[PDB]
């Protein structure tokens, strides 16, 4: 296309030059919520259908959580071409994060990194928000448009495992599925909660408080994790997930590491690093739990997707659905239909009927 | 293409499954030098011109060394498509190599383990071999289809600079290009030539052995580097090129490294790592190498090349050219005039004149 082209030469090159990234979120979020950026042309193959988590997914390409922190611009991404929206994280009070300047660009690596802190307008805010639309999100997700909820956790808390069964009980009666973020690396003690018998006790809990919903208000429960992971952590989260019979992993969040190579000027601040350098650690991750998983449990493939190619790679990995951020902060909103025909031509090419074929089929090889 | 589809899905599957990687390999040599496998189709187009290394190539997708180790299928790879051929590892004298089997398939990662430990016709069996063709090779390289050959050096040398000094004397008068490999590791010792001082007196020697030949015999020399280097050692590597002239790079050789993740039964064997798990790592490298060297040095990528994304990304990162290897054994011949027609639409796609004006693209975002 030539809107791809435009925005990749010559308007996100100029946007992103004159506003700093947090500014260009905020207007992005914006412009999405007002509906302002054109619907996506892009008609959805029935090849790219995927069921999944107990739903239809249109397409398998969605939002990862941190672009809509809020629920703000739920109906906007839909008209992106987005085949599932997560919002979120959602702290149980509202809470304003990490002081600014705490987003970084880094041009040269195609990447980002972020120290919001959980800013986030807090459950109540939120489930009002979602109030307003249920009835028509309701539609979509049985039109093949889920909406899932990230969940964080305050600060200040002192218990976690009560943060999460807060969200729960809040915005789980609103969500397709929620999200236990284990994993974001800029809240203190946070990714310690992928532990054996702390992320056993916590996720007792949630699934506890989900389970206690109305049937039609229950939503499936996913766990995000960290690319920085040991071995023993990743034989763990799997025995759990396992054990609980939790409902899918999303994998993964952003990466405290600074691989070799990084040529950004920034790349030495604080926070967790995502886009391209994040891509092959991601990619290894969920080919490392969906093997543990035995491919039993669904898994969102996340981190630096920006193609076709990056996405198949995720789902012959192993991953069910894809989401993608930071590609949209340097490609813009184009790059959603970009992944969706790159990957429609990349199966026929491969020789898959559809997405549901090529699931995991790296390790049929 | 009809055949990329039928050696991806039918033939390549079969073949692999039948035969030990070692007689596919073996197989593969005679085949290619036989000229059995058909002439390639792709019409190479002046998009994928380059002129590096004081020549022409009418495309830049080389095969890496250790294919052709022995210099005896030069003119059935051109055939292939490639837009410059590689032979070697090449020791001065004869020699078995490690016993076996030292080679290993990871399908489930698209990767192969080896350990040949340079196996070797040796100098004299190769130089006979090139002189026999050198006419030929002559007007290959005038029609921009240059060859490289690798250097080595022998298990039991007692002074590793005498080896590649040999070798400079007596393959040098028939290459467009020598390659110093440093970074083989399956010899014991040899990466240990990539520290400082040791690495300017073994560059000072070969370029002094270089600089001896008749200027129509002079190559350019290359040197190819590990992925495995500390930061420490990339930088004195880059200082040791830019003091003495060294002409260019090639980056990286396989891995001893085992990335997290890695699937294949066979992940434990020694030896070094290729396929998919190095591309990342080969990318990094290129991207720290073309910084720390101001883009005035040549860089040839190569690691996991499997397509023509992949390609661009290491041209973006600031290789001028790439090799593949590990992706033939998986996708057989096909792949070269795949890589070729698909970097071809994404240099279009992204806006660039030709090869030429994507090399080093990331380094100036
Ligand atoms: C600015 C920013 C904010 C994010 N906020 C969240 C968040 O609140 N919760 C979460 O689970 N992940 C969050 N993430 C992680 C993303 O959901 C995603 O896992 C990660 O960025 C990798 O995908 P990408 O490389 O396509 O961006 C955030 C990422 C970015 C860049
Ligand atoms: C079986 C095998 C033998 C190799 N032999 C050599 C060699 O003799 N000399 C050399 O410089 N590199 C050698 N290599 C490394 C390749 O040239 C290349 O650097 C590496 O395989 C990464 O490319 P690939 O991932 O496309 O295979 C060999 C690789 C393989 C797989
Ligand atoms: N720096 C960022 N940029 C973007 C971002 N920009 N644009 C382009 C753009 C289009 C229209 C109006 C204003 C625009 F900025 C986006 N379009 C679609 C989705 C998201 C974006 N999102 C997040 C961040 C930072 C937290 C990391
Ligand atoms: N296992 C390996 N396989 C191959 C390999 N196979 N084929 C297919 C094939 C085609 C025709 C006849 C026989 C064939 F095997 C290749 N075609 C083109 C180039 C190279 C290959 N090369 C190397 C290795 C091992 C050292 C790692
Ligand atoms: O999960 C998360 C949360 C944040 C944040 O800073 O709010 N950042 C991330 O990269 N991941
Ligand atoms: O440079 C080299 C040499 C060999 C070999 O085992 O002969 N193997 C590699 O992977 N790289
Ligand atoms: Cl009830
Ligand atoms: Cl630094
Ligand atoms: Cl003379
Ligand atoms: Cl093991």
Redesign the interface.
Known sequence: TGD??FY??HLMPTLQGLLDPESAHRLAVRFTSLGLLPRARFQDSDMLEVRVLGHKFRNPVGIAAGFDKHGEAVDGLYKMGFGFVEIGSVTPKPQEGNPRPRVFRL????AVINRYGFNSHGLSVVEHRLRARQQKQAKLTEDGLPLGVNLGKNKTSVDAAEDYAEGVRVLGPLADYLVVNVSSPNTAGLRSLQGKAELRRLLTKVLQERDGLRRVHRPAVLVKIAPDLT?QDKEDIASVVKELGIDGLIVTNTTVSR???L?GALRSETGGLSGK?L??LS???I??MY?LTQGRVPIIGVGGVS?G?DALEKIRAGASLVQLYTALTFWGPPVVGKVKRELEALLK???FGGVTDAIGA??R?
């Open positions: 791809e082209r990749a030469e041009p040269e690596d195609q071995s691989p070799a190579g040529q350098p891509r092959d990619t290894q991750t080919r490392e093997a193609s190619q090419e491969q020789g790296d390790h090889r």
